[PDB]
Amino acid sequence: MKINRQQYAESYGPTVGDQVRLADTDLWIEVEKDYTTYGDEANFGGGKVLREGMGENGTYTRTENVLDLLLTNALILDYTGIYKADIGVKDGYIVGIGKGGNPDIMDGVTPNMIVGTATEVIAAEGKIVTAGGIDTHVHFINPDQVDVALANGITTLFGGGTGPAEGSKATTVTPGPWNIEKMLKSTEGLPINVGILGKGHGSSIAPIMEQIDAGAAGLKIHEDWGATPASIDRSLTVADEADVQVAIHSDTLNEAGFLEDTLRAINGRVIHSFHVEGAGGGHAPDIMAMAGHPNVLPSSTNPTRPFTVNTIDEHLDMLMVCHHLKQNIPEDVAFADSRIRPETIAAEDILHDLGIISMMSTDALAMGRAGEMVLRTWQTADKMKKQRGPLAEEKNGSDNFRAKRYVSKYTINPAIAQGIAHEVGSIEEGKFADLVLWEPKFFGVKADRVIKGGIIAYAQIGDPSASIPTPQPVMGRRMYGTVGDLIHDTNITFMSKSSIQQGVPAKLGLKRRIGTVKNCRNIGKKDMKWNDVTTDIDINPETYEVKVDGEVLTCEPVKELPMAQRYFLF
Amino acid sequence: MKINRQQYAESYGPTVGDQVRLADTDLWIEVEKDYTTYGDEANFGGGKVLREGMGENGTYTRTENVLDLLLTNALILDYTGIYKADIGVKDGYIVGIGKGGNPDIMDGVTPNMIVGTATEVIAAEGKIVTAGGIDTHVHFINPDQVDVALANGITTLFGGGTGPAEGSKATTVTPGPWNIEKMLKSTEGLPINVGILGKGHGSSIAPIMEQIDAGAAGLKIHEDWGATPASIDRSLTVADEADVQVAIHSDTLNEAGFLEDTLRAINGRVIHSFHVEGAGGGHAPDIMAMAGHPNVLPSSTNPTRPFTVNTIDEHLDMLMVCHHLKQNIPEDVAFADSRIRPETIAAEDILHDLGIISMMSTDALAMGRAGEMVLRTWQTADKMKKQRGPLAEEKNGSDNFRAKRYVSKYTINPAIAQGIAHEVGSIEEGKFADLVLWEPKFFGVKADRVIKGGIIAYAQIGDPSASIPTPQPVMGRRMYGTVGDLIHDTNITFMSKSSIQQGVPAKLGLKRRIGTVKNCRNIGKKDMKWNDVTTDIDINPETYEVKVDGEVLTCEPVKELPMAQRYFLF
Amino acid sequence: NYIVPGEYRVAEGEIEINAGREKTTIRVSNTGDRPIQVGSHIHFVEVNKELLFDRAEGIGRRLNIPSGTAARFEPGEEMEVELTELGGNREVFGISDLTNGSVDNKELILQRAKELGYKGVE
Amino acid sequence: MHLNPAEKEKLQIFLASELALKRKARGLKLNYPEAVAIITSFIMEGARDGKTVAMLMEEGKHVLTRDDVMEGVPEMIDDIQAEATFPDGTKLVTVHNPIS
Amino acid sequence: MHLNPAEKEKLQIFLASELALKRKARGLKLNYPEAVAIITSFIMEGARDGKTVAMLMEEGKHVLTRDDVMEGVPEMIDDIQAEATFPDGTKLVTVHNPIS
Amino acid sequence: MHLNPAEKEKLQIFLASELALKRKARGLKLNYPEAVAIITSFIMEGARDGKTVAMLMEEGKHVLTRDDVMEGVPEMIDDIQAEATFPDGTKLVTVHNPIS
Ligand SMILES: [Ag+]
Ligand SMILES: [Ag+]
Ligand SMILES: [Ag+]
Ligand SMILES: [Ag+]
Ligand code: NI
Ligand code: NI
Ligand code: NI
Ligand code: NI
Ligand SMILES: [O-]
Ligand SMILES: [O-]
C-alpha cells in the first residue's frame, strides 16, 4: 500500500524532499533525510502505535534502553542538518536521535530509544524543532524579561546586571564577589539557563580574578567602565588563566586608542565582540572591522537587525534617549552621526549573509529586545534572500544552506563562544534537552513549547478552566518545569572551573544544575559553524562605506518585514 | 571655570542652599550641606568619571575599602539631616555616607568609599533618597498587600495575622506558638522586612510568654481579645522580661475602665499607643490624651490623615461597615458618634505638627491603607503649612524643620519604638541598606526604586520586551532582589532574643537574615526624634474639644489635597 | 505660583570646579582620521597616541571641565583645551599603562610614551 | 504611567463595567458580577469627577433597578464598596442595598 | 491568539487610554497617568496603522495640549516612549515634550 | 464581583476584541490575533445572550470574511475554541475554519 506525499506529510510531518515555508517569509527548508522506517512511524493517542505490546515495549525497566521522553516525528533544524527523526531524552539529556519504538515488532529502532513504561510522549509531527536559543548579550534589569525571552525560544541567558541599577542598565556586568553571589542566589528562581559576567576592568589582576573565583562565568569589558588598554589586557590575562570568555564593547570615543589600539591590547587573544556593527557601541566609525579577524568571535545585537526604513530615525532618537544627548550641543549631534550609520547597518545585513558575523544576541533592556533575537535572525535571512537571491551553495530551490548558517547564529555559535557548547546550543546526543517546538506558521515568532532539561518550561496554551487546553485565551505561560523544586533540575547555572572547584555552589546553597565553562581560549572565527569567514574589512573613515574584497557592501532598507504585523497584537 | 547653579543642579542634583519642591505640595526642602568636592563629582556612563584609572580605582580588591554599591549624588532626607552625599553600601549595609570615587586622583574621597572593580552604581543625582518606611501597624490579611506597601516606599512590616481570618482582620495578632511558626515560614516568601506580634492577652504569664519564645517580636493588646487590666499588665510584665514592644488598642467601650484605668494598669511601663486619635479604636472619647505621657510612644493610623471634607462621612460609614452597626439600634448610633469625632481628628493634625504624636502607620486592611503611610504624612505636613504657616523653628523660607519632624514619623521613630533602630529606620552608617529613591515630582507618591539589603527589590519600570526599560507601560514591579534565594539575603525577620537564643530560626529552617529586637523597655517619648513633646492633653467629655496649654486645638478640613488626583489613575 | 511638581528653586551664584588647583592651557591636534572625545578624568598624558600635544604638559593633569563632560576632537582638528591638576594621592594606574605609580615620575612616563608612539614627547 | 498595584487591578473593574453596559444595552437582564461591576465603576468615576462620598452614597442606589437585573440579584447584593482617589485623597464609598 | 508577555501588558495601555478619553469627553482636565496613557496608545495604534516613526514623533506632540490636562502635568512629562510593531517590525517611538 | 481565574482571563479576550473592532472600523485589514479575538468574544457574548452551541457553530463562520483580514490569516486559523457560561452551564464551542 502507498500513501500520497500530501497525506503522509499531514499525518507524520514532511519527509525526504518535502519543503516547508518558515512562517510567512520566502524561506523554505527541505527535509534532507529521515530516520524512520515507513509504516513503523511512532505516534501516540487512542488506537495509535505507542501502546503496550505494540510500539511501546512492555518488558524493559527504565535503565534498560528505555526513554523518559520521546519527541515523535520532529523536523529538526540545526547546524548539524535539516532532517526528520524522533528525539529521545533521558535524565534531562538528549540520548538518541533516530527512530523510537519497540524492537519487539518494529524495524529500525535505535537501540537506546525504546518507548517503555517510563516513557512520556510529545508529538512533534508537523512541528519544527530547534535547540533553545543562547543569548549571550543579556542585561539583568527586570525579571519580567525572562518570559519575554522564553516566548521567542531563548533558553540560556548569559550577561550581567543586578536589576535596574545604572551600571546594569548600561553594561552586562555583575560587579565583584558580593553582587555575583547575590545574583547567583537570585538565579535560583529564574526559569532559564544563566551565566553571569563580572566587570572586565582594573589594572591589577586580583580585583578582576576574584570575580571569577566568586562564580562569574566570564567578563565584560565596557567603555562605560573604561575600555582602556589596561582593562582589556588584564581581563584577557584573567580569562586565559580561568578559561572563560571575555565580551567587549570598545571605546566608541576613541579616547585612549582607535580600533588598531584595542586590537593591539587584545594581542591575538580570543575575544567576543558584542554589537560588532557598532550602533550598540564601539570605536567610531570602524568597529565592525573586528569581524574580519581570526581571534574575534563577532556578534550583532538585534535592533539593527535587519536594515529597515524606520531603523535610522528610530536609532538616532534611541541613542539620544539612552545617552541623554542634547540637540543643541554640537558635540552630541556629531557623536550621534559618527555612531548611527546607514552604511554600516546596511553592510551588517550582508556580513551576516556572508558568514562574517557569526552570532546574534539581544542586548536585552539596554539597547535591544529580549524576545526578538530569533525573530530578527529570520527576518534578516529573508531580506537577504529577497535582495541577494539564493546563495551559491544552495540546491533544489531550498534555502537549507542559509537556514543552517542563520540558525547557527543564535544556537551553536554563542554556546561555542561562551565555552558551554558541551552542554547546550544544538540538537545532538549527549547535550542537555533544551528544545523548542514551533508550528511552522509561527516559526521564529512565537514558540509552541519550550522544553528545559527534558520538561516543558513554557507553552502557548489556553483556558486553564476549559475541558481541553486549546480554547481561548491561548497565551505564553510557565509550565510545571518552572514550579517548585523542578526549576532546579531543569536549568543550569554556568560557572567558572575555579568557583566550582572552590565549592561556591555548596557555599551559597545553589540547587540548580551546575555547568562548567571551558574551552574558550583555544577557539577562533574558524570554530563558528557556517560562519567562519575571516577577511580584511575596510571601513572608509570619511564616507563610512564598508568594503570586503575590493567591493562596497550595500543594500537598501525594506519598508516591510515578514514575522511582523500578521502576528502581533501590538 | 564656573557652572551656573541651574545647570549644576540639572547635572548633579541640587547643592547647598538649593531648594526642591516635594511633589506638588507647598513644601520645600533645602540642601543643608554637601560632601562633594566641586569638580570631582562621581557619575557613571559613557565617557563619565567612574571608569578604570579615573573615578574608578583599578588596584583594590573588594576587601580593601571598595564598595559593593555607590549611590551617586543623593539628596538625603532623613531625621539626621537634609543634605547631599554619595551613599556607599557593602555586605547589604550602609558603610559610608560622604564622597565616593578614587583617591588615586580625586580629592576628598571618604577612605572606605572607593569605587573599584566590585562596585555597582546607582545614579541618584536629581533624586531624593530616604530610609525605607517602617510600618508598625500591619495586619497580615492578603499577601497582595506587600507590593502595595513597597510601591509607596515601605520596607518593614511589623504586625500580625494569619491571612483573612476574623481574628487577623480585626487585630495585628498572630496567636500562639503554632500560628507564629507558620507565619515565620510564610515570611520566607514575603519580599519585605517582617516582625510578628503575638496576642497580648491572658491572666497567667506562660500562655503569653510562649509566643515570645516561639518567635514573636512583640505583642498587641486589642480590645477585641479583652483589653482588660489583667491582659495589659501581664503583657507588659512579659515585655519587660523579653525586651520587646507592646502595642495597644484600648477598651473603647470603657467596659472595665476608663483611660485612667488603662494608664494605671500600664503603671509607667513603656507602651506603643496605636491609632492614638481613636477613630481606629480606643477609650471613648479621650484616648488621644495617651499622647501626652512620657511612657507612651504614640502613633496614628492613616485614614484620619489628614482631616478632609470627606473624612467624617467616610469614617462614620466605614465604622458601620467594619463593626456591622445597625442604624436602627440607638446604642450603635451612640457608639459611632462617641468614636468618630471631628474635634479629635482636627486636633490630631495639629498634634502631629507639634511633635506630640510621634509616629505614622497604616492599619493595613483592617482600618487603614497599606500604601499610604508615606503619602498621607506629607499631605498632613502640607495642610499644616497652609493652615498654621511655617513653624517658628524654620529658616530661609525652607520647610526643613517640618520635613525632618515628619519624615521621622514613618522612618526612625517606629524603628526606635519597636527595638529595631540598630538595623533599620534611617540613612546612617552601620544600618541595613533599605533605601528608597524618589523623583521629586513623585516624592511620597510613588517610589522610583526600593533597595532592600543593597539590592533593588521593587521599581517603577517599563516594557520588559523593549530596547530600553523606560517605554510604556511603566508600572511597579518586583526586581531581582525578590527572586530565588536572594529574597533571603535582602530581608530581615525580626525576632525576640529568647526565640533567637532558643534556635527557632534553625528549628524552622528560616533562611532570611534574623534581626534581634532589643532596647524597647528603657525608652520613652523623649526618645522620639523631633517628636518628643510631653504635655497635659485635655479632652472635654461633653464637647470633645482638645486642649493643650489652655488652648483649644482645632483646624478646618480641606476640600483638596496635593499627591492625589494629579497622580492616580483611580 | 503655578506648581511644577518637584521643581528646583536653586540658590544664587555659581559653582567653581577644581577650585584652588593650577590651570594650564595647551594646544592639541587630532592627527588621526576618526574623531576622538576625551573625558574629564582621564590622565591627560595617556590619551590616544594620535593626539599631538606637548605630552609632558599632560602629566599629573586632566581636563578642567565639569565632572562627566568631554572635549571633542574631530579628525584633523586642532584646538586649545584647559587642564587642571589631578588631586588625591596623585597616582595613576592602568588606563594606557604609562604611569602605574606617582605622577611625579615624569621621565619614566615620557620614556614609556615615546617608546609606544604617543605623539608629542619632546 | 507609574501604575501601582491598585491602579492595575481597578482597570479591570472599569473593563468589566464596559462589558456589562454593552450587555445591558442589548437588552439583557444583568447578573451578579455585571451589576457589581457597573455600580463599582460608577463610584470610582464619580470620585474622579469630584463628587463627594455623600453624593455617591445616594446616587449609587439609583444606578440599577430590579428590572435591570436577574431574579435574586437585588437580594444577593447587600452593599458595594469601593475606594477611589477623590480631590481630597483616597476615601471609601459604601453603597448600601444598591438595587431595590 | 498566542499572546506573548508584551501583548498582554500593552492591552492595559489601550484600556487606560479608553478610560482617559471617556474622562476627557465628559469635560475633565486629565491627570498624569491619563495623559501618558492617551499619547502612548496613540503611538501604538499609529504604528498599527502603518505610520512611520518620524510621523508619530511629530503627531504625538499634538494629541493633547495644556488646556486638556491639569496644572503641572505638561511639565511632569518629559517624553513618552513606546515600542510597537510597525510594518517593518518593532521600533521605538519617543515623543519629546508631548504637551506644551 | 468574586472573579475566578477564568473570569479574570476572559476579560482580556473582550478587551482584545474591542481593540480589533476599532482597528477594523478605521479600515485596517485584521491580523491573526485580532481576528481570533473578534470571533472568540463573539462566541462568548453569544453564550451570554443565550444562543445554543449549534447556533454559534454556524454564526461564528460569518463574523469575518477573507476581505476583512490580512493575506494568509484565513489559512492560519483552523478553528477557534471558546468555553462560556450558557443558560445550561459552561459548554465548549468550536468554530471550524471560521474565515473562508
Ligand atoms: Ag547610550
Ligand atoms: Ag544605548
Ligand atoms: Ag469595627
Ligand atoms: Ag474598624
Ligand atoms: Ni554595549
Ligand atoms: Ni549591552
Ligand atoms: Ni486597632
Ligand atoms: Ni489595626
Ligand atoms: O550594549
Ligand atoms: O486597628
Side-chain angles (χ1 to χ4, degrees), chain A residues 14-20 29-34 75 82-84 400:
Chain A
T15 185
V16 191
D18 297 343
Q19 297 178 350
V20 191
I29 61 171
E30 186 173 317
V31 182
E32 289 164 344
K33 63 192 167 165
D34 184 344
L75 175 45
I82 298 165
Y83 62 94
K84 187 77 175 297
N400 284 24

Side-chain angles (χ1 to χ4, degrees), chain A residues 486-559:
Chain A
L486 188 49
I487 202 178
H488 305 141
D489 292 1
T490 55
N491 295 295
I492 301 162
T493 301
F494 294 99
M495 298 177 74
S496 61
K497 295 187 254 185
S498 59
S499 74
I500 293 164
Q501 187 169 86
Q502 280 167 43
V504 177
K507 181 183 70 183
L508 306 175
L510 310 180
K511 288 150 93 158
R512 277 163 66 111
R513 305 196 45 92
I514 301 306
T516 302
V517 171
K518 71 194 186 185
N519 306 312
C520 305
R521 310 317 301 163
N522 52 0
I523 56 181
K525 187 62 165 288
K526 64 173 195 312
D527 300 299
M528 304 278 99
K529 307 298 184 182
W530 301 107
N531 291 267
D532 59 355
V533 180
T534 57
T535 192
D536 288 322
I537 299 175
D538 185 84
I539 296 173
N540 188 305
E542 279 179 32
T543 65
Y544 302 167
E545 298 170 74
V546 184
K547 284 167 68 152
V548 164
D549 294 334
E551 208 160 41
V552 174
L553 299 187
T554 195
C555 56
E556 289 304 290
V558 289
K559 277 156 268 171

Side-chain angles (χ1 to χ4, degrees), chain B residues 308 310-311 314 317 321 369 372 376 442 446 460 472-476 559-561 564-565 568-570, chain D residues 1-5 7 10-11 47-48 52-54 57 81 83 85-88 90-92 94 96:
Chain B
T308 78
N310 281 306
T311 298
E314 165 198 40
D317 210 74
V321 173
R369 288 171 182 120
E372 300 194 8
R376 289 166 176 264
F442 282 121
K446 286 164 178 192
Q460 284 279 355
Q472 296 302 316
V474 176
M475 60 176 86
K559 277 156 268 171
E560 186 178 345
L561 290 181
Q565 282 188 345
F568 291 102
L569 194 56
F570 290 97
Chain D
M1 288 186 278
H2 282 59
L3 300 181
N4 66 19
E7 287 165 318
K10 295 180 179 170
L11 274 169
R48 177 66 181 85
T52 62
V53 167
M57 297 182 74
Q81 302 165 30
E83 299 212 343
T85 305
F86 287 79
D88 57 336
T90 305
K91 311 283 164 191
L92 167 70
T94 299
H96 299 266

Side-chain angles (χ1 to χ4, degrees), chain B residues 137 139 170-172 220 222 249 274-275 280-281 301 339 363 366-367:
Chain B
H137 196 141
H139 295 248
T171 78
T172 58
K220 169 64 172 296
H222 198 292
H249 165 144
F274 268 182
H275 40 58
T301 53
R339 180 159 164 178
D363 211 336
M367 197 160 186

Side-chain angles (χ1 to χ4, degrees), chain B residues 241-299:
Chain B
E241 193 202 324
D243 198 13
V244 299
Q245 199 49 264
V246 173
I248 186 160
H249 165 144
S250 63
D251 177 356
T252 304
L253 305 188
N254 298 314
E255 174 191 61
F258 287 126
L259 176 63
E260 57 272 21
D261 302 278
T262 286
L263 287 162
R264 191 172 306 111
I266 289 164
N267 195 28
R269 298 168 287 186
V270 186
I271 199 167
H272 182 164
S273 187
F274 268 182
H275 40 58
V276 78
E277 179 279 328
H283 289 284
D286 58 346
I287 181 68
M288 191 162 63
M290 284 292 259
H293 295 260
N295 58 318
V296 171
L297 311 170
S299 65

Side-chain angles (χ1 to χ4, degrees), chain A residues 308 317 369 372 569-570, chain E residues 2 7 83 85 88 90 96:
Chain A
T308 78
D317 210 74
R369 288 171 182 120
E372 300 194 8
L569 194 56
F570 290 97
Chain E
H2 282 59
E7 287 165 318
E83 299 212 343
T85 305
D88 57 336
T90 305
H96 299 266

Side-chain angles (χ1 to χ4, degrees), chain B residues 192-462:
Chain B
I192 193 155
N193 301 334
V194 163
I196 290 172
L197 303 182
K199 190 190 292 177
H201 295 270
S203 49
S204 302
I205 293 293
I208 301 177
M209 187 56 86
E210 57 175 351
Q211 296 175 118
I212 302 301
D213 299 338
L219 297 165
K220 169 64 172 296
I221 305 164
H222 198 292
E223 80 177 311
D224 283 25
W225 298 115
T228 60
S231 282
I232 294 165
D233 170 62
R234 300 321 184 267
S235 289
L236 289 165
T237 295
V238 162
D240 274 345
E241 193 202 324
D243 198 13
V244 299
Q245 199 49 264
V246 173
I248 186 160
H249 165 144
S250 63
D251 177 356
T252 304
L253 305 188
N254 298 314
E255 174 191 61
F258 287 126
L259 176 63
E260 57 272 21
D261 302 278
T262 286
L263 287 162
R264 191 172 306 111
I266 289 164
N267 195 28
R269 298 168 287 186
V270 186
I271 199 167
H272 182 164
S273 187
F274 268 182
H275 40 58
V276 78
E277 179 279 328
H283 289 284
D286 58 346
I287 181 68
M288 191 162 63
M290 284 292 259
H293 295 260
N295 58 318
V296 171
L297 311 170
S299 65
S300 295
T301 53
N302 73 13
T304 59
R305 317 275 81 247
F307 181 36
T308 78
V309 301
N310 281 306
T311 298
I312 300 297
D313 287 334
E314 165 198 40
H315 280 60
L316 274 176
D317 210 74
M318 186 190 297
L319 179 63
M320 167 181 176
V321 173
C322 181
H323 251 61
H324 293 69
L325 296 182
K326 307 277 299 206
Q327 282 137 356
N328 65 351
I329 299 160
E331 295 87 335
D332 288 4
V333 170
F335 167 69
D337 292 338
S338 75
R339 180 159 164 178
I340 307 307
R341 306 161 296 255
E343 296 74 12
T344 60
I345 296 168
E348 187 190 22
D349 280 359
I350 299 150
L351 298 180
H352 270 289
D353 207 46
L354 292 174
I356 295 169
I357 302 164
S358 297
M359 293 173 285
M360 295 290 200
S361 61
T362 63
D363 211 336
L365 287 168
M367 197 160 186
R369 288 171 182 120
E372 300 194 8
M373 172 173 65
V374 180
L375 186 77
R376 289 166 176 264
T377 297
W378 301 107
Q379 286 168 335
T380 301
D382 174 80
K383 176 183 187 285
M384 293 298 90
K385 181 178 179 186
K386 285 162 169 127
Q387 302 179 325
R388 302 184 71 244
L391 294 168
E393 300 90 319
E394 306 285 9
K395 205 32 215 290
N396 200 50
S398 97
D399 301 297
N400 284 24
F401 182 89
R402 226 184 220 113
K404 291 166 204 180
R405 160 164 294 164
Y406 279 78
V407 74
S408 298
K409 307 173 178 278
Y410 65 82
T411 59
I412 191 56
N413 294 343
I416 290 161
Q418 207 65 244
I420 70 182
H422 56 295
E423 293 286 355
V424 294
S426 60
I427 304 181
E428 298 179 67
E429 294 174 350
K431 291 203 199 185
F432 198 57
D434 282 350
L435 294 171
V436 186
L437 286 87
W438 308 86
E439 296 187 73
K441 68 193 189 191
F442 282 121
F443 175 80
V445 182
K446 286 164 178 192
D448 162 49
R449 276 166 287 176
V450 181
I451 301 170
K452 285 295 292 82
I455 297 292
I456 299 160
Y458 197 82
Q460 284 279 355
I461 191 163

